[PDB]
Amino acid sequence: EKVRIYRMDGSYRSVELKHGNNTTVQQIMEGMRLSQETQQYFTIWICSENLSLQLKPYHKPLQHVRDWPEILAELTNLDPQRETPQLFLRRDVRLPLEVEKQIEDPLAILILFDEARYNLLKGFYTAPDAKLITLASLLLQIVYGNYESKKHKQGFLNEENLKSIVPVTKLKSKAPHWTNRILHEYKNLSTSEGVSKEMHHLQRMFLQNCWEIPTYGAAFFTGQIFTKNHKVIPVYVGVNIKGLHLLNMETKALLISLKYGCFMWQLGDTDTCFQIHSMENKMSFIVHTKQAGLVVKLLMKLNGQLM
Amino acid sequence: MREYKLVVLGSGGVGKSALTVQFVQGIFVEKYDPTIEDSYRKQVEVDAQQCMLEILDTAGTEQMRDLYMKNGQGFALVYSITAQSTFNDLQDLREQILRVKDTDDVPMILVGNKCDLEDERVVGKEQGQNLARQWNNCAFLESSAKSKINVNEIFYDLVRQINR
Ligand SMILES: Nc1nc2c(ncn2[C@@H]2O[C@H](COP(=O)(O)OP(=O)(O)NP(=O)(O)O)[C@@H](O)[C@H]2O)c(=O)[nH]1
Numbered sequence A: 001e002k003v004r005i006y007r008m009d010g011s012y013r014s015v016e017l018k019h020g021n022n023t024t025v026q027q028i029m030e031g032m033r034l035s036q037e038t039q040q041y042f043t044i045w046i047c048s049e050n051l052s053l054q055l056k057p058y059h060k061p062l063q064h065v066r067d068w069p070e071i072l073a074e075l076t077n078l079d080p081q082r083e084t085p086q087l088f089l090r091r092d093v094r095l096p097l098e099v100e101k102q103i104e105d106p107l108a109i110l111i112l113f114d115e116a117r118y119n120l121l122k123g124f125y126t127a128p129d130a131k132l133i134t135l136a137s138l139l140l141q142i143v144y145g146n147y148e149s150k151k152h153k154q155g156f157l158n159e160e161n162l163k164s165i166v167p168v169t170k171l172k173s174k175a176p177h178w179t180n181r182i183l184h185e186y187k188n189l190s191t192s193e194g195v196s197k198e199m200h201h202l203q204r205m206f207l208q209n210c211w212e213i214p215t216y217g218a219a220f221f222t223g224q225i226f227t228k229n230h231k232v233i234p235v236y237v238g239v240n241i242k243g244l245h246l247l248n249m250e251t252k253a254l255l256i257s258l259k260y261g262c263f264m265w266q267l268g269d270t271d272t273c274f275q276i277h278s279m280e281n282k283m284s285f286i287v288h289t290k291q292a293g294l295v296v297k298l299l300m301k302l303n304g305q306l307m
Numbered sequence B: 001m002r003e004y005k006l007v008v009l010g011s012g013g014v015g016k017s018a019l020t021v022q023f024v025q026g027i028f029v030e031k032y033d034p035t036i037e038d039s040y041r042k043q044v045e046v047d048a049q050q051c052m053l054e055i056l057d058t059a060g061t062e063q064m065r066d067l068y069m070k071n072g073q074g075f076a077l078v079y080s081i082t083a084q085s086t087f088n089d090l091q092d093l094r095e096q097i098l099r100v101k102d103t104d105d106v107p108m109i110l111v112g113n114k115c116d117l118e119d120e121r122v123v124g125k126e127q128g129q130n131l132a133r134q135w136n137n138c139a140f141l142e143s144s145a146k147s148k149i150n151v152n153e154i155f156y157d158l159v160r161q162i163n164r
């Protein structure tokens, strides 16, 4: 018995299931090619198109795949016929930023790098144009190698090549005006002999620019808010080791970002919503979602980790 | 961007995974972990074009083998110059691929791995070149996953053979 454990880039590793569908996350984690250093940073997630859940070491992932239509009905209003789940190896949402900042293992770095790159291209990283251009330039070095005037000065950064290095939400309107600044920083990276060209060193540079993004490492949930005629605004709810972040589901625009200690939460009695009180703002809002129980529990655990 | 389906075949222990991981991730896998089935993706530039490579890393000790050759576009056939049996086994593989593809025009390369272990060699270089010539002048390379010798050239050459 075996299962494919995927990663964000489409790759997978098949792992033997010693105990069939009773095999645990911990057992599957052992079946990978990860040392104790590489292992502690990641865990098994179960994800379909519009629901991604971090699993626990004692969980049995194949039973979650089996029970997925019931999990979708409990936590979402989604259509279960288009949501076949798969198993992924992804960054542990509880991983403290201070721990990640001292990682030197090349395998852990590339696994984190690929997930970070996936979030950037999908539009889940909100950052100023300077930060985005810097990330795009690092991707050109990592993927296309050293800058060459013959190959990259003109007729290179078309939208086909732009897809790979800029967020999809910026491909149309803003990225085409960035191509000159991107190529300049790309040229600066290749010619600056003080910048290490080691693959894992370049991937760590990419991550360093991602660590200051507010939604970095966030687990994303789906919900709705009503606006002060009340209008419905579907939202992504991002919870990470820094706090809570609200993204417009359609544009990925950052509606609000709140650090731990600067806001409070309350789970609704109905369990299908939660309220947020922005300290030092007098502002409150309520998010309607059947994942409210998970969001609040995660908010408590990540707030409780901090010192 | 064009996608290329590449398959690394060979008997157990030859270094299929080490060669694949070195090419994709830049790491030398040291501990021997028998592979069930691993797939990798990697964007490279071959002949001034960006190519998305899907590399299938296969098990060397059991056969789903027919689906690999039905779907694969190019095939790296790997042996170890340390083990004579792994060289002897590649003959069956080369003929199985030609059978499933129903043609001898199949992108393919013969790879003699562990060329860093010279003081452990059992299969001579000339015997590898001899076999490649037998295989309708098939491409041939000696490689090492540690020393990074002829690692990228394996997958680059398959891409060119697919393009031709
Ligand atoms: N010295 C040396 N050792 C190598 C080389 N390539 C692989 N090895 C070693 O050979 C062993 C087996 O390597 P591996 O890639 O797992 O071989 P495999 O063909 O994938 N085995 P399997 O078919 O079971 O999946 C490992 O200990 C690895 O370090 C090489 O070029 N040089």
Ligand SMILES: *Cc1c(O)ccc2cc(C#C)ccc12
Pocket (backbone or CB within 6 Å): A052, A053, A054, A093, A094, A219, A220, A294, A297, A298, A301
């Ligand atoms: C309850 C819980 C804990 O304790 C840790 C991490 C979690 C992640 C997700 C996701 C996605 C849901 C619940 C979690």
Ligand SMILES: [Mg+2]
Pocket (backbone or CB within 6 Å): B016, B017, B018, B033, B034, B035, B057, B058
């Ligand atoms: Mg292997």
